[PDB]
Amino acid sequence: VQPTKFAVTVRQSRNWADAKQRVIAAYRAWIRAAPEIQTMYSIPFPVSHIRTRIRQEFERHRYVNKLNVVDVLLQQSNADFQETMNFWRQQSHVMAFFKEEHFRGEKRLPSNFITGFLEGRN
Amino acid sequence: YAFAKGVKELRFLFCQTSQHSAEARSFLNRAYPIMKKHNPTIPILLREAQGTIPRVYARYEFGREKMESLEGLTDKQIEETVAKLVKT
Amino acid sequence: TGRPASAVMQAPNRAEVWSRSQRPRSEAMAGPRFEQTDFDAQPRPWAAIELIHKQPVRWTHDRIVACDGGGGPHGHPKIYINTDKPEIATCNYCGLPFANEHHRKYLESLPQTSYPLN
Amino acid sequence: ISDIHITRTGKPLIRIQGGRSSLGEHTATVFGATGQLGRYIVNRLARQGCT
Amino acid sequence: AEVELTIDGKKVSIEAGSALIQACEKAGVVVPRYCYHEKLAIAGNCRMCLVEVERSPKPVASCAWPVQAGMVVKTNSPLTHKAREGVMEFLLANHPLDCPICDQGGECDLQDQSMRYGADRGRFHEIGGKRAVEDKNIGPLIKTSMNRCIHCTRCVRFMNDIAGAPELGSTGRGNDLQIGTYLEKNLDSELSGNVIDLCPVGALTSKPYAFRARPWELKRTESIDVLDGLGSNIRVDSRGLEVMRILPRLNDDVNEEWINDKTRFACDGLKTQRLTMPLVRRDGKFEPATWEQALTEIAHAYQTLAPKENEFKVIAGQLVEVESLVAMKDLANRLGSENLALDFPGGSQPLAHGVDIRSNYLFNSKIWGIEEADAILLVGTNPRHEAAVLNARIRKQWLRSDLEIAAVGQPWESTFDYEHLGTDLAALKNALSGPFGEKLKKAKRPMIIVGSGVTEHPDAKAFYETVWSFVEKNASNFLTEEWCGYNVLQRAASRAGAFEVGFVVPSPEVAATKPKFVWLLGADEFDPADVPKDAFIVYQGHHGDRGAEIADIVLPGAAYTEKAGTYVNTEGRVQMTRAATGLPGAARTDWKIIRAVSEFLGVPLPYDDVAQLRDRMAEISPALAAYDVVEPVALRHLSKVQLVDQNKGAKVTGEPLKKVVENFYFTDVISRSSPTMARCSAAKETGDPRTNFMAPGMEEDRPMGQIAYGA
Amino acid sequence: PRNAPDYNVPIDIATSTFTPVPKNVQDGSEENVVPAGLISGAPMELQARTVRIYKPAKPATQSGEKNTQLWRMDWDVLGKGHRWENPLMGWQSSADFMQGTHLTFKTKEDAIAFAEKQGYEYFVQEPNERHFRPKAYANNFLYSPGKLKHIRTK
Ligand SMILES: NC(=O)C1=CN([C@@H]2O[C@H](COP(=O)(O)OP(=O)(O)OC[C@H]3O[C@@H](n4cnc5c(N)ncnc54)[C@H](OP(=O)(O)O)[C@@H]3O)[C@@H](O)[C@H]2O)C=CC1
Ligand SMILES: *P(=O)(O)OCC(C)(C)[C@H](O)C(=O)NCCC(=O)NCCSC(=O)CCCCCCCCCCCCC
Ligand code: SF4
Ligand code: SF4
Ligand code: FES
Ligand SMILES: [Zn+2]
């Protein structure tokens, strides 16, 4: 954090015990920060919705069994954390991570075959 | 001996020169012409391709279809298996 | 639309389209955007096709004639036109008419001709 | 939601359902559009490709 | 055998008796050429292939120089360099400065090889000027700007040798030598549009594709021709949502750098009478409808009828892909119907050949088998009209070998000599046991081609057992390890695929049942007797033609240019089309229309991604999984049981074999909608050589012009 | 479940009404392949659409073969969203973000390796090659003992 408030020197996981330790510390910081993210970015959602949505973004990469893949996925998180905790991301970038503030909404793929057929592939 | 009424189409899938299909190839070279003489109103399609694990498909009314494999089976064992598919 | 003549006639000189994929001005200038609009202010250039066919023929005694567009280096790439058919030959780049003097008798006998011919 | 709209008079519309550059193919006239409600009806048609 | 030689140092291994330019290609060496074409006879006129050969005082023309056991070739020596600049200076001295107005611009070999082997500037400034020549009227399809002719002779060689149409020539002498018929004539050849692609320059261009596009702006898709049964490989060049032109791509197994005129010009018929929205017939007038309430009125009508077993009938047209056959086959089966008819007459009854052995209905000695054919009997087929590119391959073998052709059927205007044996079945029995039979019996690699036009002949059962019984009597010549002299020739791109998935009527019983409901699946050539008048007609297709005229519902599908359909060609090769554009209007993918009407009739077909529907096709026929290859038939001898055993007692009537193609230009709905084929027919009929026959351009009787194209 | 489209994939910001429904999204667990599509930042739609790996055919219009020498990977056109007509100027509008993007590869296996690394669906088209045949200028003037059946005209 020498050059910037939430800077972390790029580090390469030594092994799976180390790599899982870092993931849990990353998740902990994010869900800790959710009240602070909800006031600054004036997110019109419960802190619970923010936390459950933060969980989904870690739940996507729960089955990665490559150690070189985890470090890039950790660096992406740390950088996202830094630009959100410093007021660098605009409210527009942050509340665009929630995929229900599209005027089409969360429902943007067709539900099944027939409903996407009657609408021309959605 | 014909197939039981209610069978619509037989489909043998096998390989032209694979060893896995020689037993099936032996069966059809001795079975199919008699199988077609008895009941000519049914299609009996022989469709092959390189590396086709031998299979048979029996279709009935309303498009219900059964598949029994043929790998490992000898020339004799096939006849009962198709008979199970075509007798009721 | 419709009421003014400029909104209806494809060019000031010509009333009809001159290619199969040209949109008529009647259909191009229909719709909401052309309401509360001056159609006499709209860009309406004179059609080139009518002007080119008002051009008199260059009579020539030669089989091959050279056309550069008529302005030296201010014309088109210099090309060569063969005038051996009993018709009027036209420059591919500019459209000007050329005709051999041998076909003047035949050309003067036709009822309708693609160029003034005099 | 459908890609085809037969208007009450009978002409058919073949819409492509996307965003700004799309083809909503509905033509609308909103009288009273400069108040507080009209900006919501106008924006909803326009942002989906309608005149 | 193999000679060995060095070209620019590197050893190449080329067969003895081939030309040097062929070994330069094999050695990875680019040699500039204009006159030489791989598929045309050698001509040494251009002089652009002049290379330096050790022990030769002059530069040699590499295209005409046979390879010898020890020669040395320098292709980059200073001899070669000044040779190529000197020729490029001569080829450009009289060339018209017409690159902005030329259609060959951006794809011209004269331009590219001027940039690569010529000088950067020109030294021709004569006050006397350049050569100029008058234009020539050689039919509607080809526009001529002959000033551009570089005298390669590629088109005279193509028209005289491949097309068998010797009307193009070269009259005159010296600089005043000219290409064209001396007396204006309409080039009458269903292959004549190949001259436009062969032209190194734009002196031969296409009147339809007159000035519409530049080559750089075209998206190129490698797809398949479906306008004939041969499955010709093509390139579809499109600018956005409009197909601009269709070109030929190489496939030596099928079409060999050549396409016919129908497959090249019918693409203007893809933007003229398209079905773009669902239609319902209300009070005798077709009203527009949505999909949700056109598929509903399909279901409501079906529930009202409550059809019994086999009362729901399907007729599959001739441009239908295999994916929608398998899908419509399933939905038909879940409705208790095996009534799976085909467009042609006799297609609603079982076929004389079966579909049990693949070899029953295929061109078994593959298209490439003609290259070694020794004797050929054509039965019920005018191959010049039914399979144009195939017809050319027959003539190529005929012109270079002792090939004997005999035909039983209707006499036609042939590009090769052939013996005519008769027109009816007796004239086949009398031939097959007559003088020409011993030609088949004696000549190795014999070939009997049976036209798909006999399948619709009433005597096909007798015709097919007549042929195969001769084949079975004459094996070890007809039925060797790698050869099969039995060949059935499709003319529609859908027939071999339907036969492969078993999309046929199984029994005479299902054939006699009157349907209450007919799904015309792209079917437009159905005989009126095969659709009962009072039935409920659904038409699914892409062009408004006869089928949509009688429909009660019209459902717009996709043309072959905006779907990736599977097609099987007459030889059994399974090829895939690539979509070049998207669907127009509210049209839908054809297999998806079937899958959706499965929800509305309550029997949803399981698959709902096209990947799943290709897994199902694999269960019906695994060859359908193999792409761009023919799968050989193993039990080729089992074919006797359908052809001879189930065809034993045949009620011969003696009616002669009938022509199938009244108009080569008007065969399908895409063709019939095409303005260009309209002009091709009218010019054929009235014998008009004028390029602007029903087209833009000034005439004697049109001083003013005309904007109509096609009328 | 055997080519079943996962209708419940979680969409992202760039998912649209033209995005097809994918069957398989790189979980990050598959053996021997990097899950590059998982860490690329690309949308999910790249994992739904099929790409074609092929060697471009030589133009029929000309004899240069420079463009046939390298394998091209391009995206297949979809039934909707590829091109529509602009109501105002008549221009052609698109929703296909991959329409103008193509990749070049030296070998077929180099393209397959990239496709699997990114999670693309791919169809490989095997090149069509010529059949060699010795061509001889001398044949143009071969002697016919019998009927000519051809009048060669240079
Ligand atoms: N908002 C509410 O609480 C409720 C409103 N409504 C009705 O809903 C409608 C829209 O509501 P809202 O957006 O709040 O209305 P606003 O008062 O905010 O806007 C009304 C619109 O009407 C136009 N307008 C008013 N008088 C005239 C006139 N004489 N000639 C031409 N144009 C005129 C105004 O244009 P300009 O600005 O130039 O005057 C404006 O665009 C109105 O009819 C309103 O009474 C109904 C129930 C409740
Ligand atoms: P438990 O032992 O069951 O699980 C522990 C873990 C998850 C470590 C597994 O055991 C495991 O090994 N899984 C694979 C390793 C792994 O999870 N890799 C990825 C870790 S980094 C990561 O997932 C980053 C996700 C995104 C980070 C940002 C999230 C919030 C962004 C948006 C916030 C709202 C808007 C501002
Ligand atoms: S043929 Fe080629 S070089 Fe000649 S004018 Fe046309 S583009 Fe230019
Ligand atoms: S017209 Fe074209 S193909 Fe024919 S000789 Fe002239 S340049 Fe060659
Ligand atoms: S290429 Fe040999 S002379 Fe033209
Ligand atoms: Zn000029």
PDB file of all heavy atoms in Angstrom, chain E residues 277-299:
ATOM      1  N   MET E 277     -43.224 -13.186 -43.240  1.00  0.00           N
ATOM      2  CA  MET E 277     -44.066 -13.176 -42.053  1.00  0.00           C
ATOM      3  C   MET E 277     -45.116 -14.270 -42.173  1.00  0.00           C
ATOM      4  O   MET E 277     -45.426 -14.699 -43.283  1.00  0.00           O
ATOM      5  CB  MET E 277     -44.727 -11.806 -41.863  1.00  0.00           C
ATOM      6  CG  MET E 277     -45.627 -11.391 -42.980  1.00  0.00           C
ATOM      7  SD  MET E 277     -46.247  -9.733 -42.730  1.00  0.00           S
ATOM      8  CE  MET E 277     -46.531  -9.225 -44.418  1.00  0.00           C
ATOM      9  N   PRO E 278     -45.656 -14.757 -41.059  1.00  0.00           N
ATOM     10  CA  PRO E 278     -46.691 -15.789 -41.140  1.00  0.00           C
ATOM     11  C   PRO E 278     -47.980 -15.280 -41.762  1.00  0.00           C
ATOM     12  O   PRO E 278     -48.388 -14.139 -41.564  1.00  0.00           O
ATOM     13  CB  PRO E 278     -46.900 -16.194 -39.679  1.00  0.00           C
ATOM     14  CG  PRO E 278     -45.659 -15.857 -39.027  1.00  0.00           C
ATOM     15  CD  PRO E 278     -45.183 -14.597 -39.679  1.00  0.00           C
ATOM     16  N   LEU E 279     -48.627 -16.161 -42.513  1.00  0.00           N
ATOM     17  CA  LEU E 279     -49.838 -15.852 -43.254  1.00  0.00           C
ATOM     18  C   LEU E 279     -50.921 -16.853 -42.903  1.00  0.00           C
ATOM     19  O   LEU E 279     -50.649 -18.042 -42.748  1.00  0.00           O
ATOM     20  CB  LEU E 279     -49.591 -15.872 -44.756  1.00  0.00           C
ATOM     21  CG  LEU E 279     -48.652 -14.840 -45.359  1.00  0.00           C
ATOM     22  CD1 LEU E 279     -48.464 -15.111 -46.827  1.00  0.00           C
ATOM     23  CD2 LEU E 279     -49.170 -13.441 -45.141  1.00  0.00           C
ATOM     24  N   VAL E 280     -52.148 -16.368 -42.767  1.00  0.00           N
ATOM     25  CA  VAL E 280     -53.316 -17.207 -42.531  1.00  0.00           C
ATOM     26  C   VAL E 280     -54.345 -16.874 -43.605  1.00  0.00           C
ATOM     27  O   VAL E 280     -54.567 -15.699 -43.908  1.00  0.00           O
ATOM     28  CB  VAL E 280     -53.907 -16.983 -41.129  1.00  0.00           C
ATOM     29  CG1 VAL E 280     -55.326 -17.492 -41.077  1.00  0.00           C
ATOM     30  CG2 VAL E 280     -53.061 -17.620 -40.063  1.00  0.00           C
ATOM     31  N   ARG E 281     -54.938 -17.895 -44.206  1.00  0.00           N
ATOM     32  CA  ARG E 281     -55.968 -17.702 -45.225  1.00  0.00           C
ATOM     33  C   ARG E 281     -57.306 -17.444 -44.546  1.00  0.00           C
ATOM     34  O   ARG E 281     -57.908 -18.357 -43.980  1.00  0.00           O
ATOM     35  CB  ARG E 281     -56.043 -18.928 -46.125  1.00  0.00           C
ATOM     36  CG  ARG E 281     -57.072 -18.858 -47.192  1.00  0.00           C
ATOM     37  CD  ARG E 281     -57.028 -20.115 -48.012  1.00  0.00           C
ATOM     38  NE  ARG E 281     -55.765 -20.244 -48.718  1.00  0.00           N
ATOM     39  CZ  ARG E 281     -55.649 -20.165 -50.037  1.00  0.00           C
ATOM     40  NH1 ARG E 281     -56.720 -19.955 -50.783  1.00  0.00           N
ATOM     41  NH2 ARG E 281     -54.467 -20.287 -50.607  1.00  0.00           N
ATOM     42  N   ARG E 282     -57.778 -16.203 -44.598  1.00  0.00           N
ATOM     43  CA  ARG E 282     -59.025 -15.808 -43.954  1.00  0.00           C
ATOM     44  C   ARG E 282     -59.986 -15.289 -45.007  1.00  0.00           C
ATOM     45  O   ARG E 282     -59.706 -14.279 -45.655  1.00  0.00           O
ATOM     46  CB  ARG E 282     -58.779 -14.755 -42.879  1.00  0.00           C
ATOM     47  CG  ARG E 282     -58.060 -15.308 -41.690  1.00  0.00           C
ATOM     48  CD  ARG E 282     -57.765 -14.269 -40.645  1.00  0.00           C
ATOM     49  NE  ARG E 282     -56.815 -14.777 -39.665  1.00  0.00           N
ATOM     50  CZ  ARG E 282     -56.359 -14.080 -38.630  1.00  0.00           C
ATOM     51  NH1 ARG E 282     -56.776 -12.837 -38.428  1.00  0.00           N
ATOM     52  NH2 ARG E 282     -55.491 -14.628 -37.789  1.00  0.00           N
ATOM     53  N   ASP E 283     -61.117 -15.969 -45.159  1.00  0.00           N
ATOM     54  CA  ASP E 283     -62.128 -15.603 -46.149  1.00  0.00           C
ATOM     55  C   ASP E 283     -61.522 -15.548 -47.545  1.00  0.00           C
ATOM     56  O   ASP E 283     -61.837 -14.669 -48.349  1.00  0.00           O
ATOM     57  CB  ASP E 283     -62.805 -14.279 -45.793  1.00  0.00           C
ATOM     58  CG  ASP E 283     -63.633 -14.374 -44.533  1.00  0.00           C
ATOM     59  OD1 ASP E 283     -64.134 -15.478 -44.238  1.00  0.00           O
ATOM     60  OD2 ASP E 283     -63.784 -13.348 -43.838  1.00  0.00           O
ATOM     61  N   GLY E 284     -60.631 -16.492 -47.827  1.00  0.00           N
ATOM     62  CA  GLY E 284     -60.009 -16.575 -49.125  1.00  0.00           C
ATOM     63  C   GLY E 284     -58.923 -15.565 -49.380  1.00  0.00           C
ATOM     64  O   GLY E 284     -58.474 -15.444 -50.524  1.00  0.00           O
ATOM     65  N   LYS E 285     -58.483 -14.831 -48.365  1.00  0.00           N
ATOM     66  CA  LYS E 285     -57.406 -13.871 -48.540  1.00  0.00           C
ATOM     67  C   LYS E 285     -56.357 -14.120 -47.474  1.00  0.00           C
ATOM     68  O   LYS E 285     -56.694 -14.295 -46.302  1.00  0.00           O
ATOM     69  CB  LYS E 285     -57.927 -12.430 -48.472  1.00  0.00           C
ATOM     70  CG  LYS E 285     -56.895 -11.364 -48.822  1.00  0.00           C
ATOM     71  CD  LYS E 285     -56.153 -10.877 -47.593  1.00  0.00           C
ATOM     72  CE  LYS E 285     -55.179  -9.770 -47.916  1.00  0.00           C
ATOM     73  NZ  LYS E 285     -54.432  -9.331 -46.701  1.00  0.00           N
ATOM     74  N   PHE E 286     -55.088 -14.107 -47.877  1.00  0.00           N
ATOM     75  CA  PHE E 286     -53.997 -14.359 -46.946  1.00  0.00           C
ATOM     76  C   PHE E 286     -53.762 -13.150 -46.061  1.00  0.00           C
ATOM     77  O   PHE E 286     -53.325 -12.103 -46.538  1.00  0.00           O
ATOM     78  CB  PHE E 286     -52.717 -14.706 -47.698  1.00  0.00           C
ATOM     79  CG  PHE E 286     -52.524 -16.158 -47.920  1.00  0.00           C
ATOM     80  CD1 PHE E 286     -52.444 -16.671 -49.195  1.00  0.00           C
ATOM     81  CD2 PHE E 286     -52.390 -17.011 -46.850  1.00  0.00           C
ATOM     82  CE1 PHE E 286     -52.254 -18.004 -49.402  1.00  0.00           C
ATOM     83  CE2 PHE E 286     -52.208 -18.351 -47.048  1.00  0.00           C
ATOM     84  CZ  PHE E 286     -52.137 -18.850 -48.333  1.00  0.00           C
ATOM     85  N   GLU E 287     -54.025 -13.300 -44.766  1.00  0.00           N
ATOM     86  CA  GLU E 287     -53.781 -12.216 -43.824  1.00  0.00           C
ATOM     87  C   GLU E 287     -52.474 -12.416 -43.069  1.00  0.00           C
ATOM     88  O   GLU E 287     -52.092 -13.547 -42.778  1.00  0.00           O
ATOM     89  CB  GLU E 287     -54.918 -12.104 -42.813  1.00  0.00           C
ATOM     90  CG  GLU E 287     -56.239 -11.648 -43.366  1.00  0.00           C
ATOM     91  CD  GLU E 287     -56.161 -10.324 -44.097  1.00  0.00           C
ATOM     92  OE1 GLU E 287     -55.191  -9.566 -43.888  1.00  0.00           O
ATOM     93  OE2 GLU E 287     -57.103 -10.016 -44.856  1.00  0.00           O
ATOM     94  N   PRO E 288     -51.768 -11.332 -42.768  1.00  0.00           N
ATOM     95  CA  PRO E 288     -50.613 -11.431 -41.877  1.00  0.00           C
ATOM     96  C   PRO E 288     -51.017 -11.871 -40.486  1.00  0.00           C
ATOM     97  O   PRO E 288     -52.123 -11.603 -40.024  1.00  0.00           O
ATOM     98  CB  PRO E 288     -50.053 -10.009 -41.866  1.00  0.00           C
ATOM     99  CG  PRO E 288     -50.463  -9.453 -43.129  1.00  0.00           C
ATOM    100  CD  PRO E 288     -51.783 -10.057 -43.496  1.00  0.00           C
ATOM    101  N   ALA E 289     -50.099 -12.559 -39.819  1.00  0.00           N
ATOM    102  CA  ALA E 289     -50.322 -13.057 -38.476  1.00  0.00           C
ATOM    103  C   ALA E 289     -48.987 -13.107 -37.755  1.00  0.00           C
ATOM    104  O   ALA E 289     -47.930 -13.032 -38.375  1.00  0.00           O
ATOM    105  CB  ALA E 289     -50.981 -14.439 -38.480  1.00  0.00           C
ATOM    106  N   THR E 290     -49.047 -13.207 -36.435  1.00  0.00           N
ATOM    107  CA  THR E 290     -47.862 -13.468 -35.641  1.00  0.00           C
ATOM    108  C   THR E 290     -47.573 -14.960 -35.594  1.00  0.00           C
ATOM    109  O   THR E 290     -48.344 -15.782 -36.083  1.00  0.00           O
ATOM    110  CB  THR E 290     -48.012 -12.930 -34.225  1.00  0.00           C
ATOM    111  OG1 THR E 290     -49.222 -13.418 -33.657  1.00  0.00           O
ATOM    112  CG2 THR E 290     -48.012 -11.420 -34.214  1.00  0.00           C
ATOM    113  N   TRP E 291     -46.427 -15.304 -35.008  1.00  0.00           N
ATOM    114  CA  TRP E 291     -46.071 -16.708 -34.865  1.00  0.00           C
ATOM    115  C   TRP E 291     -46.921 -17.382 -33.799  1.00  0.00           C
ATOM    116  O   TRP E 291     -47.367 -18.515 -33.992  1.00  0.00           O
ATOM    117  CB  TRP E 291     -44.588 -16.850 -34.535  1.00  0.00           C
ATOM    118  CG  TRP E 291     -43.696 -16.836 -35.723  1.00  0.00           C
ATOM    119  CD1 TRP E 291     -42.928 -15.805 -36.145  1.00  0.00           C
ATOM    120  CD2 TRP E 291     -43.469 -17.908 -36.646  1.00  0.00           C
ATOM    121  NE1 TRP E 291     -42.248 -16.155 -37.272  1.00  0.00           N
ATOM    122  CE2 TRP E 291     -42.560 -17.445 -37.600  1.00  0.00           C
ATOM    123  CE3 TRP E 291     -43.948 -19.216 -36.751  1.00  0.00           C
ATOM    124  CZ2 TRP E 291     -42.121 -18.239 -38.652  1.00  0.00           C
ATOM    125  CZ3 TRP E 291     -43.522 -19.991 -37.789  1.00  0.00           C
ATOM    126  CH2 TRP E 291     -42.622 -19.507 -38.730  1.00  0.00           C
ATOM    127  N   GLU E 292     -47.179 -16.695 -32.676  1.00  0.00           N
ATOM    128  CA  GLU E 292     -47.929 -17.324 -31.593  1.00  0.00           C
ATOM    129  C   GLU E 292     -49.348 -17.649 -32.023  1.00  0.00           C
ATOM    130  O   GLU E 292     -49.924 -18.640 -31.569  1.00  0.00           O
ATOM    131  CB  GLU E 292     -47.934 -16.457 -30.334  1.00  0.00           C
ATOM    132  CG  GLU E 292     -48.589 -15.083 -30.475  1.00  0.00           C
ATOM    133  CD  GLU E 292     -47.574 -13.980 -30.665  1.00  0.00           C
ATOM    134  OE1 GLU E 292     -46.394 -14.297 -30.918  1.00  0.00           O
ATOM    135  OE2 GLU E 292     -47.953 -12.795 -30.560  1.00  0.00           O
ATOM    136  N   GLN E 293     -49.932 -16.841 -32.896  1.00  0.00           N
ATOM    137  CA  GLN E 293     -51.255 -17.140 -33.416  1.00  0.00           C
ATOM    138  C   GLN E 293     -51.258 -17.393 -34.907  1.00  0.00           C
ATOM    139  O   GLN E 293     -52.171 -16.957 -35.598  1.00  0.00           O
ATOM    140  CB  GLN E 293     -52.256 -16.051 -33.027  1.00  0.00           C
ATOM    141  CG  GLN E 293     -51.939 -14.630 -33.410  1.00  0.00           C
ATOM    142  CD  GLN E 293     -52.422 -14.217 -34.776  1.00  0.00           C
ATOM    143  OE1 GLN E 293     -53.406 -14.742 -35.291  1.00  0.00           O
ATOM    144  NE2 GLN E 293     -51.771 -13.210 -35.341  1.00  0.00           N
ATOM    145  N   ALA E 294     -50.239 -18.065 -35.416  1.00  0.00           N
ATOM    146  CA  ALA E 294     -50.349 -18.876 -36.616  1.00  0.00           C
ATOM    147  C   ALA E 294     -50.069 -20.329 -36.281  1.00  0.00           C
ATOM    148  O   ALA E 294     -50.649 -21.233 -36.881  1.00  0.00           O
ATOM    149  CB  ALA E 294     -49.390 -18.377 -37.699  1.00  0.00           C
ATOM    150  N   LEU E 295     -49.174 -20.545 -35.322  1.00  0.00           N
ATOM    151  CA  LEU E 295     -48.931 -21.869 -34.780  1.00  0.00           C
ATOM    152  C   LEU E 295     -50.113 -22.348 -33.962  1.00  0.00           C
ATOM    153  O   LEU E 295     -50.333 -23.555 -33.829  1.00  0.00           O
ATOM    154  CB  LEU E 295     -47.673 -21.850 -33.928  1.00  0.00           C
ATOM    155  CG  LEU E 295     -46.350 -21.681 -34.651  1.00  0.00           C
ATOM    156  CD1 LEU E 295     -45.239 -21.855 -33.659  1.00  0.00           C
ATOM    157  CD2 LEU E 295     -46.253 -22.698 -35.756  1.00  0.00           C
ATOM    158  N   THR E 296     -50.863 -21.414 -33.378  1.00  0.00           N
ATOM    159  CA  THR E 296     -52.091 -21.773 -32.681  1.00  0.00           C
ATOM    160  C   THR E 296     -53.139 -22.313 -33.642  1.00  0.00           C
ATOM    161  O   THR E 296     -53.713 -23.377 -33.407  1.00  0.00           O
ATOM    162  CB  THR E 296     -52.630 -20.563 -31.927  1.00  0.00           C
ATOM    163  OG1 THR E 296     -51.730 -20.238 -30.867  1.00  0.00           O
ATOM    164  CG2 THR E 296     -53.986 -20.855 -31.344  1.00  0.00           C
ATOM    165  N   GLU E 297     -53.396 -21.598 -34.732  1.00  0.00           N
ATOM    166  CA  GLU E 297     -54.384 -22.053 -35.699  1.00  0.00           C
ATOM    167  C   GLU E 297     -53.926 -23.280 -36.448  1.00  0.00           C
ATOM    168  O   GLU E 297     -54.744 -23.951 -37.079  1.00  0.00           O
ATOM    169  CB  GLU E 297     -54.732 -20.934 -36.677  1.00  0.00           C
ATOM    170  CG  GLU E 297     -55.464 -19.801 -36.043  1.00  0.00           C
ATOM    171  CD  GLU E 297     -54.520 -18.887 -35.365  1.00  0.00           C
ATOM    172  OE1 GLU E 297     -53.320 -19.172 -35.488  1.00  0.00           O
ATOM    173  OE2 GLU E 297     -54.951 -17.920 -34.702  1.00  0.00           O
ATOM    174  N   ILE E 298     -52.633 -23.580 -36.421  1.00  0.00           N
ATOM    175  CA  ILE E 298     -52.204 -24.907 -36.833  1.00  0.00           C
ATOM    176  C   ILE E 298     -52.739 -25.943 -35.856  1.00  0.00           C
ATOM    177  O   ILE E 298     -53.400 -26.907 -36.251  1.00  0.00           O
ATOM    178  CB  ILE E 298     -50.674 -24.965 -36.958  1.00  0.00           C
ATOM    179  CG1 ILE E 298     -50.218 -24.149 -38.173  1.00  0.00           C
ATOM    180  CG2 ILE E 298     -50.213 -26.390 -37.070  1.00  0.00           C
ATOM    181  CD1 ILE E 298     -48.736 -24.032 -38.325  1.00  0.00           C
ATOM    182  N   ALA E 299     -52.529 -25.713 -34.563  1.00  0.00           N
ATOM    183  CA  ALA E 299     -52.936 -26.678 -33.554  1.00  0.00           C
ATOM    184  C   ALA E 299     -54.449 -26.801 -33.473  1.00  0.00           C
ATOM    185  O   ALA E 299     -54.983 -27.909 -33.355  1.00  0.00           O
ATOM    186  CB  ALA E 299     -52.363 -26.279 -32.203  1.00  0.00           C
TER     187      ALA E 299
END
